[PDB]
Amino acid sequence: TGYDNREIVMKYIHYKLSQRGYTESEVVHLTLRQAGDDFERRYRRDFAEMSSQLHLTPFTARGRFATVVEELFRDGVNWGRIVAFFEFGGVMCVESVNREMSPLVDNIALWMTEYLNRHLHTWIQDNGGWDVFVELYG
């Protein structure tokens, strides 16, 4: 579902960028937006430490992103770490637009869907699908 995953990332990043003032899948999209919101308000200090791990510049390679997010999933995947992953990406995008590097947003959106598709969807399909995320978080 690489198509659906790219769409989920773009909806979340678009939501997040507009919030900071810079029938199919709709229920997953809505749930994820809510989850990211709850997460950022609950885990402010902890999220600041995650975000401080990486500042994307026009120089930065997907590897550097992959290494910081690998550490988040070092010893497994839970829905709370997946929400952290989406908020992380959001923060990178907001930092990018804030410092007039708006073209990095599309780069970050691709990095996120590739990490989703390769490292996370595999876990999701053994842990109840997006339907389970929706009933947990929606």
């Binding site: 997460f39 609950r42 885990y43 902890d46 070092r74 010893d75 497994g76 995947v77 839970n78 829905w79 709370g80 770490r81 929400v83 952290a84």
Partner: peptide, 11 residues
Amino acid sequence: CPARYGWDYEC
């Protein structure tokens, strides 16, 4: 997973 982040407790 072993809890390394405050969000791990809700899972």
